[PDB]
Amino acid sequence: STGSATTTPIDSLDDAYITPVQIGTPAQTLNLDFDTGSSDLWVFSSETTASEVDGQTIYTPSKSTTAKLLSGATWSISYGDGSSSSGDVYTDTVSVGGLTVTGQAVESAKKVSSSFTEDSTIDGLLGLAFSTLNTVSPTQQKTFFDNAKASLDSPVFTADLGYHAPGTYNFGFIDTTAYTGSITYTAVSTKQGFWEWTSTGYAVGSGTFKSTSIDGIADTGTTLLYLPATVVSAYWAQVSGAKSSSSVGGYVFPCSATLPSFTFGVGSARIVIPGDYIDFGPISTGSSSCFGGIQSSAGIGINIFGDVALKAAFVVFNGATTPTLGFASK
């Protein structure tokens, strides 16, 4: 089997991407944030505290004839951005772009943190990291991809995120028309439950490539590119008027400035992030100070190849017995 679904930016800055998912019988369609940095499929629901729902579409398990309470099960998650949610668990039929899993754990939110309430466009998350990170207790549950894997033509999914435009998540096949050149594959460590890999280096604009190992994660659920402070400093030094603002909480720059591209290495291959992908607009409405899309990972404890980086590539998440990641230009 295969599946293919379009993923759409939630706003004009590409802050996140939403993908429609069918849950239950008859289908209830929710727009979920596909997140290769986490491993829970959770949704706003009829069980979510009423004051914490503000425009989201909810899943109502009682209206699904295929929903079954996973008795005794609870879940609770906190994300790198300080946001959180928790609740109980149902199993139900979940379909993405034509690909159907029966018995998928659907984690129903009883509580969500403010950041989720305040974002009316995201109805929940669909985790695509490794199932070892799944928070369901007492019995850890599998991700949608893990459940689908054996049925797929090939045990892979691909992320093709758009810049200020829709893109595509495919399951079970590689669309050879969706990228240029070749796909370069690179090793993955699953020790922390992430799609963790090591970049071979970077360049700033037309500058020379610096060969240096950068360990980080391919995370579709993180907006920006978070890299070591040395790398980030070298980038912003090439933007006149850029500076790190402790009050804003990262590098900002005047939008009259021209942003250089940023290149990262995948083995001997090179992915070029155009300068425009690094502009995240005014820090506040009317401000001439713009927020940067490359920021320091210091104090995150891990480097994150978030949407800023991933949307410059066609990315293969290869779930073979030994997982690997593939990157192509596009």
Side-chain angles (χ1 to χ4, degrees), residues 232-242 244-287:
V232 178
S233 184
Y235 177 81
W236 289 108
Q238 300 302 315
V239 181
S240 199
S244 182
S245 165
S246 57
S247 66
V248 174
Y251 282 89
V252 298
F253 68 98
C255 334
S256 55
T258 294
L259 297 183
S261 60
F262 184 91
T263 299
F264 65 92
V266 182
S268 58
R270 304 292 179 250
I271 301 297
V272 180
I273 303 171
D276 289 340
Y277 289 26
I278 298 158
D279 177 10
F280 279 76
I283 60 171
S284 288
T285 301
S287 181

Short mmCIF file of all heavy atoms in Angstrom, two decimals, residues 232-287, unseen atoms left out:
data_model
loop_
_atom_site.label_atom_id
_atom_site.label_comp_id
_atom_site.label_asym_id
_atom_site.label_seq_id
_atom_site.Cartn_x
_atom_site.Cartn_y
_atom_site.Cartn_z
N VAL A 232 26.03 29.64 14.07
CA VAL A 232 25.01 30.69 13.99
C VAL A 232 25.63 32.07 13.98
O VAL A 232 25.22 32.93 13.21
CB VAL A 232 23.97 30.49 15.12
CG1 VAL A 232 22.93 31.58 15.12
CG2 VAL A 232 23.29 29.13 14.94
N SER A 233 26.66 32.28 14.81
CA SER A 233 27.38 33.55 14.83
C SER A 233 28.02 33.84 13.48
O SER A 233 27.97 34.97 12.98
CB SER A 233 28.44 33.52 15.93
OG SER A 233 29.10 34.77 16.05
N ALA A 234 28.63 32.82 12.88
CA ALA A 234 29.24 32.99 11.56
C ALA A 234 28.23 33.37 10.48
O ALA A 234 28.55 34.14 9.56
CB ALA A 234 29.98 31.73 11.15
N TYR A 235 27.01 32.86 10.59
CA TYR A 235 25.97 33.21 9.64
C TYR A 235 25.58 34.67 9.78
O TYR A 235 25.63 35.44 8.81
CB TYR A 235 24.72 32.29 9.78
CG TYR A 235 23.64 32.72 8.81
CD1 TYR A 235 23.68 32.34 7.48
CD2 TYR A 235 22.63 33.57 9.23
CE1 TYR A 235 22.71 32.79 6.58
CE2 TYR A 235 21.68 34.05 8.34
CZ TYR A 235 21.72 33.65 7.02
OH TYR A 235 20.78 34.14 6.15
N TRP A 236 25.19 35.07 10.99
CA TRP A 236 24.61 36.40 11.19
C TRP A 236 25.66 37.51 11.06
O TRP A 236 25.30 38.66 10.77
CB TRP A 236 23.83 36.48 12.51
CG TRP A 236 22.57 35.68 12.41
CD1 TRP A 236 22.30 34.48 13.02
CD2 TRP A 236 21.41 35.99 11.63
NE1 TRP A 236 21.06 34.04 12.66
CE2 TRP A 236 20.49 34.95 11.80
CE3 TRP A 236 21.08 37.06 10.78
CZ2 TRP A 236 19.24 34.94 11.18
CZ3 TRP A 236 19.85 37.05 10.16
CH2 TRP A 236 18.94 36.00 10.37
N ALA A 237 26.93 37.16 11.23
CA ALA A 237 28.02 38.12 10.98
C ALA A 237 28.04 38.62 9.54
O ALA A 237 28.67 39.65 9.26
CB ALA A 237 29.38 37.50 11.33
N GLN A 238 27.38 37.89 8.64
CA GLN A 238 27.32 38.26 7.23
C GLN A 238 26.05 39.03 6.88
O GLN A 238 25.79 39.28 5.70
CB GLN A 238 27.46 37.03 6.34
CG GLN A 238 28.76 36.27 6.55
CD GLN A 238 29.97 37.15 6.30
OE1 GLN A 238 30.03 37.90 5.31
NE2 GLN A 238 30.93 37.09 7.21
N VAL A 239 25.29 39.41 7.90
CA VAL A 239 24.08 40.21 7.73
C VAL A 239 24.26 41.54 8.44
O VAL A 239 24.31 41.61 9.66
CB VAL A 239 22.87 39.46 8.28
CG1 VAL A 239 21.60 40.29 8.08
CG2 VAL A 239 22.73 38.06 7.63
N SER A 240 24.36 42.62 7.67
CA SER A 240 24.66 43.89 8.28
C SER A 240 23.51 44.33 9.18
O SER A 240 22.34 44.28 8.79
CB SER A 240 25.00 44.95 7.24
OG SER A 240 25.69 46.03 7.85
N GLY A 241 23.85 44.71 10.40
CA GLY A 241 22.86 45.16 11.36
C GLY A 241 22.23 44.04 12.17
O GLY A 241 21.41 44.31 13.03
N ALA A 242 22.58 42.79 11.90
CA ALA A 242 22.03 41.69 12.68
C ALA A 242 22.67 41.64 14.06
O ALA A 242 23.84 41.98 14.24
CB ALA A 242 22.23 40.36 11.95
N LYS A 243 21.89 41.23 15.05
CA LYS A 243 22.44 41.03 16.37
C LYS A 243 21.59 40.08 17.18
O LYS A 243 20.43 39.84 16.87
CB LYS A 243 22.60 42.36 17.09
CG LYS A 243 21.35 43.15 17.24
CD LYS A 243 21.70 44.56 17.73
N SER A 244 22.19 39.51 18.21
CA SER A 244 21.45 38.64 19.10
C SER A 244 20.83 39.47 20.21
O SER A 244 21.52 40.21 20.92
CB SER A 244 22.36 37.58 19.69
OG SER A 244 21.60 36.72 20.51
N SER A 245 19.52 39.37 20.34
CA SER A 245 18.78 40.15 21.31
C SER A 245 18.28 39.26 22.43
O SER A 245 17.45 38.39 22.20
CB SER A 245 17.57 40.81 20.64
OG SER A 245 16.65 41.29 21.61
N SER A 246 18.78 39.47 23.63
CA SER A 246 18.34 38.66 24.76
C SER A 246 16.86 38.92 25.05
O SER A 246 16.14 38.00 25.43
CB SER A 246 19.20 38.90 26.00
OG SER A 246 19.21 40.27 26.37
N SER A 247 16.39 40.15 24.86
CA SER A 247 14.99 40.44 25.15
C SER A 247 14.05 39.73 24.16
O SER A 247 13.01 39.21 24.55
CB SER A 247 14.71 41.94 25.18
OG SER A 247 14.89 42.52 23.90
N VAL A 248 14.43 39.71 22.89
CA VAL A 248 13.64 39.00 21.89
C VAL A 248 13.87 37.49 21.97
O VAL A 248 12.96 36.71 21.72
CB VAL A 248 13.92 39.55 20.47
CG1 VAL A 248 13.20 38.72 19.41
CG2 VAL A 248 13.51 41.00 20.39
N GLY A 249 15.08 37.08 22.34
CA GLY A 249 15.39 35.67 22.49
C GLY A 249 15.97 35.03 21.24
O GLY A 249 15.72 33.86 20.94
N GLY A 250 16.73 35.82 20.50
CA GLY A 250 17.53 35.29 19.42
C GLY A 250 18.01 36.38 18.50
O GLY A 250 17.86 37.57 18.79
N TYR A 251 18.55 35.96 17.36
CA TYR A 251 19.06 36.88 16.36
C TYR A 251 17.91 37.56 15.61
O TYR A 251 16.95 36.91 15.18
CB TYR A 251 19.97 36.14 15.38
CG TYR A 251 21.34 35.86 15.92
CD1 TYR A 251 21.60 34.69 16.63
CD2 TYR A 251 22.38 36.75 15.72
CE1 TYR A 251 22.86 34.44 17.14
CE2 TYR A 251 23.65 36.50 16.21
CZ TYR A 251 23.88 35.34 16.92
OH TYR A 251 25.14 35.08 17.41
N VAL A 252 18.04 38.87 15.47
CA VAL A 252 17.12 39.70 14.71
C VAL A 252 17.95 40.51 13.71
O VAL A 252 19.16 40.63 13.87
CB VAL A 252 16.32 40.64 15.63
CG1 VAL A 252 15.45 39.84 16.60
CG2 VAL A 252 17.27 41.60 16.39
N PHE A 253 17.30 41.07 12.70
CA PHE A 253 18.00 41.80 11.66
C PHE A 253 17.04 42.77 10.98
O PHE A 253 15.83 42.55 11.00
CB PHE A 253 18.58 40.82 10.63
CG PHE A 253 17.54 40.11 9.82
CD1 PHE A 253 17.20 40.56 8.56
CD2 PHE A 253 16.86 39.01 10.32
CE1 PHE A 253 16.23 39.92 7.82
CE2 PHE A 253 15.89 38.38 9.58
CZ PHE A 253 15.58 38.83 8.33
N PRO A 254 17.56 43.86 10.39
CA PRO A 254 16.69 44.75 9.62
C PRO A 254 16.34 44.13 8.28
O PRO A 254 17.19 43.59 7.60
CB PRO A 254 17.54 46.00 9.43
CG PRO A 254 18.94 45.51 9.47
CD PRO A 254 18.97 44.31 10.38
N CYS A 255 15.07 44.21 7.93
CA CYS A 255 14.55 43.53 6.77
C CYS A 255 15.03 44.18 5.47
O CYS A 255 14.89 43.59 4.39
CB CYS A 255 13.07 43.61 6.94
SG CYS A 255 12.84 43.76 8.74
N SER A 256 15.59 45.38 5.58
CA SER A 256 16.31 46.00 4.48
C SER A 256 17.60 45.25 4.14
O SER A 256 18.20 45.45 3.07
CB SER A 256 16.64 47.46 4.81
OG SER A 256 17.34 47.57 6.04
N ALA A 257 18.04 44.38 5.06
CA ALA A 257 19.24 43.59 4.84
C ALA A 257 18.94 42.46 3.87
O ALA A 257 17.81 41.97 3.79
CB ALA A 257 19.77 43.04 6.16
N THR A 258 19.97 42.04 3.13
CA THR A 258 19.87 40.88 2.26
C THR A 258 20.42 39.68 3.02
O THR A 258 21.56 39.73 3.51
CB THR A 258 20.67 41.09 0.96
OG1 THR A 258 20.07 42.14 0.19
CG2 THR A 258 20.73 39.82 0.14
N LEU A 259 19.62 38.62 3.12
CA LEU A 259 20.05 37.39 3.78
C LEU A 259 20.81 36.48 2.83
O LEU A 259 20.34 36.15 1.73
CB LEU A 259 18.87 36.62 4.37
CG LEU A 259 18.07 37.31 5.47
CD1 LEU A 259 16.99 36.39 5.97
CD2 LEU A 259 18.98 37.73 6.63
N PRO A 260 22.00 36.05 3.25
CA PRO A 260 22.73 35.05 2.48
C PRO A 260 22.08 33.69 2.62
O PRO A 260 21.34 33.44 3.58
CB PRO A 260 24.12 35.06 3.11
CG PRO A 260 23.93 35.60 4.47
CD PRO A 260 22.76 36.50 4.44
N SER A 261 22.35 32.81 1.66
CA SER A 261 21.92 31.43 1.77
C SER A 261 22.72 30.74 2.87
O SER A 261 23.72 31.29 3.36
CB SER A 261 22.14 30.70 0.44
OG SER A 261 23.52 30.73 0.10
N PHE A 262 22.28 29.55 3.25
CA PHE A 262 23.00 28.71 4.19
C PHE A 262 23.00 27.31 3.61
O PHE A 262 21.94 26.77 3.30
CB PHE A 262 22.34 28.70 5.56
CG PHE A 262 23.11 27.91 6.61
CD1 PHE A 262 24.05 28.53 7.39
CD2 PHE A 262 22.86 26.57 6.80
CE1 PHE A 262 24.76 27.82 8.35
CE2 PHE A 262 23.55 25.85 7.75
CZ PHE A 262 24.50 26.48 8.54
N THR A 263 24.19 26.73 3.48
CA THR A 263 24.36 25.39 2.91
C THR A 263 24.73 24.43 4.02
O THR A 263 25.61 24.76 4.85
CB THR A 263 25.49 25.40 1.84
OG1 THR A 263 25.13 26.29 0.78
CG2 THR A 263 25.71 24.00 1.26
N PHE A 264 24.06 23.27 4.07
CA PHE A 264 24.51 22.21 4.96
C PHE A 264 24.89 20.95 4.19
O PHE A 264 24.35 20.67 3.11
CB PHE A 264 23.49 21.93 6.09
CG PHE A 264 22.16 21.38 5.63
CD1 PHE A 264 21.94 20.01 5.55
CD2 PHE A 264 21.10 22.23 5.36
CE1 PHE A 264 20.69 19.50 5.15
CE2 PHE A 264 19.85 21.74 4.98
CZ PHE A 264 19.64 20.38 4.88
N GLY A 265 25.85 20.21 4.73
CA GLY A 265 26.35 19.00 4.09
C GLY A 265 25.61 17.73 4.47
O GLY A 265 25.26 17.52 5.65
N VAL A 266 25.39 16.87 3.47
CA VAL A 266 24.85 15.53 3.68
C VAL A 266 25.84 14.63 2.95
O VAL A 266 25.85 14.56 1.73
CB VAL A 266 23.41 15.38 3.11
CG1 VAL A 266 22.87 14.00 3.39
CG2 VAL A 266 22.47 16.46 3.67
N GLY A 267 26.73 14.00 3.71
CA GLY A 267 27.85 13.32 3.08
C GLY A 267 28.59 14.32 2.20
O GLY A 267 28.87 15.43 2.63
N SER A 268 28.90 13.93 0.97
CA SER A 268 29.58 14.83 0.04
C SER A 268 28.60 15.77 -0.68
O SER A 268 29.02 16.67 -1.41
CB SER A 268 30.37 14.01 -0.97
OG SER A 268 29.52 13.14 -1.66
N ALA A 269 27.30 15.58 -0.46
CA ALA A 269 26.28 16.40 -1.11
C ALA A 269 25.99 17.67 -0.30
O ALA A 269 26.41 17.81 0.85
CB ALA A 269 24.99 15.59 -1.34
N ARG A 270 25.27 18.60 -0.92
CA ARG A 270 25.04 19.92 -0.34
C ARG A 270 23.58 20.33 -0.56
O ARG A 270 23.08 20.26 -1.69
CB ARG A 270 25.98 20.94 -1.01
CG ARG A 270 27.48 20.60 -0.94
CD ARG A 270 28.01 20.67 0.48
NE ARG A 270 29.44 20.31 0.55
CZ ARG A 270 29.93 19.20 1.10
NH1 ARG A 270 29.13 18.27 1.62
NH2 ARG A 270 31.25 19.02 1.11
N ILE A 271 22.92 20.75 0.53
CA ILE A 271 21.59 21.33 0.48
C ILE A 271 21.69 22.83 0.73
O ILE A 271 22.26 23.27 1.74
CB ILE A 271 20.63 20.68 1.50
CG1 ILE A 271 20.51 19.17 1.26
CG2 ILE A 271 19.25 21.35 1.45
CD1 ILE A 271 19.89 18.81 -0.10
N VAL A 272 21.15 23.61 -0.20
CA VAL A 272 21.23 25.07 -0.10
C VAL A 272 19.89 25.64 0.34
O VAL A 272 18.88 25.48 -0.35
CB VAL A 272 21.67 25.70 -1.44
CG1 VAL A 272 21.74 27.20 -1.29
CG2 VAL A 272 23.01 25.14 -1.92
N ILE A 273 19.88 26.28 1.50
CA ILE A 273 18.72 27.00 2.01
C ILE A 273 18.78 28.45 1.49
O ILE A 273 19.66 29.20 1.90
CB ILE A 273 18.71 27.02 3.56
CG1 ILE A 273 18.74 25.60 4.14
CG2 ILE A 273 17.48 27.77 4.08
CD1 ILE A 273 18.96 25.60 5.65
N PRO A 274 17.86 28.85 0.60
CA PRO A 274 17.89 30.24 0.11
C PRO A 274 17.72 31.25 1.24
O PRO A 274 17.05 30.97 2.23
CB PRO A 274 16.71 30.29 -0.88
CG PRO A 274 16.52 28.83 -1.30
CD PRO A 274 16.77 28.07 -0.02
N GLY A 275 18.35 32.41 1.11
CA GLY A 275 18.25 33.44 2.12
C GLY A 275 16.83 33.77 2.57
O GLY A 275 16.59 33.95 3.77
N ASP A 276 15.89 33.85 1.62
CA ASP A 276 14.50 34.18 1.95
C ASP A 276 13.85 33.20 2.94
O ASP A 276 12.92 33.56 3.67
CB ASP A 276 13.62 34.23 0.69
CG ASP A 276 13.89 35.42 -0.20
OD1 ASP A 276 14.47 36.42 0.27
OD2 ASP A 276 13.48 35.34 -1.38
N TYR A 277 14.34 31.96 3.00
CA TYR A 277 13.75 30.96 3.88
C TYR A 277 14.07 31.28 5.34
O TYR A 277 13.46 30.72 6.23
CB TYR A 277 14.29 29.56 3.58
CG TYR A 277 13.86 28.89 2.29
CD1 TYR A 277 13.47 29.63 1.18
CD2 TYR A 277 13.85 27.51 2.19
CE1 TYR A 277 13.10 28.99 0.00
CE2 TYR A 277 13.48 26.87 1.02
CZ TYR A 277 13.09 27.61 -0.08
OH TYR A 277 12.72 26.96 -1.24
N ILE A 278 15.03 32.17 5.56
CA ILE A 278 15.57 32.47 6.89
C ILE A 278 14.90 33.74 7.49
O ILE A 278 15.18 34.13 8.62
CB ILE A 278 17.12 32.52 6.79
CG1 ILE A 278 17.65 31.13 6.36
CG2 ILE A 278 17.79 32.91 8.11
CD1 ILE A 278 19.04 31.19 5.71
N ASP A 279 13.99 34.34 6.74
CA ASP A 279 13.27 35.56 7.19
C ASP A 279 11.94 35.16 7.84
O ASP A 279 11.08 34.59 7.17
CB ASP A 279 13.05 36.45 5.99
CG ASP A 279 12.26 37.70 6.30
OD1 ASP A 279 12.03 37.98 7.49
OD2 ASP A 279 11.92 38.43 5.33
N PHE A 280 11.78 35.45 9.12
CA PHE A 280 10.52 35.18 9.82
C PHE A 280 9.76 36.44 10.24
O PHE A 280 8.89 36.40 11.11
CB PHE A 280 10.74 34.17 10.95
CG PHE A 280 10.77 32.77 10.43
CD1 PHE A 280 11.91 32.30 9.78
CD2 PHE A 280 9.64 31.98 10.48
CE1 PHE A 280 11.91 31.06 9.20
CE2 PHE A 280 9.64 30.73 9.91
CZ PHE A 280 10.78 30.27 9.29
N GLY A 281 10.06 37.53 9.55
CA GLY A 281 9.22 38.72 9.61
C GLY A 281 9.38 39.56 10.85
O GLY A 281 10.16 39.25 11.73
N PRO A 282 8.60 40.64 10.93
CA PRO A 282 8.72 41.57 12.06
C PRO A 282 8.49 40.91 13.41
O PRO A 282 7.61 40.05 13.55
CB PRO A 282 7.66 42.63 11.75
CG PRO A 282 7.50 42.56 10.25
CD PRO A 282 7.68 41.12 9.89
N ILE A 283 9.28 41.31 14.40
CA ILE A 283 9.18 40.73 15.73
C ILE A 283 7.82 41.06 16.34
O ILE A 283 7.28 40.29 17.13
CB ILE A 283 10.35 41.13 16.63
CG1 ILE A 283 10.42 42.64 16.82
CG2 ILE A 283 11.68 40.59 16.07
CD1 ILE A 283 11.40 43.07 17.85
N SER A 284 7.29 42.22 15.95
CA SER A 284 5.95 42.67 16.32
C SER A 284 5.40 43.49 15.16
O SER A 284 6.16 44.04 14.36
CB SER A 284 5.98 43.54 17.58
OG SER A 284 6.25 42.77 18.73
N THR A 285 4.08 43.58 15.06
CA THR A 285 3.48 44.28 13.93
C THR A 285 4.03 45.71 13.86
O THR A 285 4.08 46.42 14.85
CB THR A 285 1.95 44.32 14.05
OG1 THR A 285 1.45 42.98 14.09
CG2 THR A 285 1.34 45.03 12.88
N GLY A 286 4.48 46.10 12.67
CA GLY A 286 4.99 47.43 12.44
C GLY A 286 6.48 47.61 12.73
O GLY A 286 7.04 48.66 12.40
N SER A 287 7.13 46.61 13.33
CA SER A 287 8.54 46.73 13.65
C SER A 287 9.42 46.59 12.42
O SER A 287 9.12 45.81 11.50
CB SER A 287 8.96 45.68 14.69
OG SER A 287 10.35 45.80 15.02
#
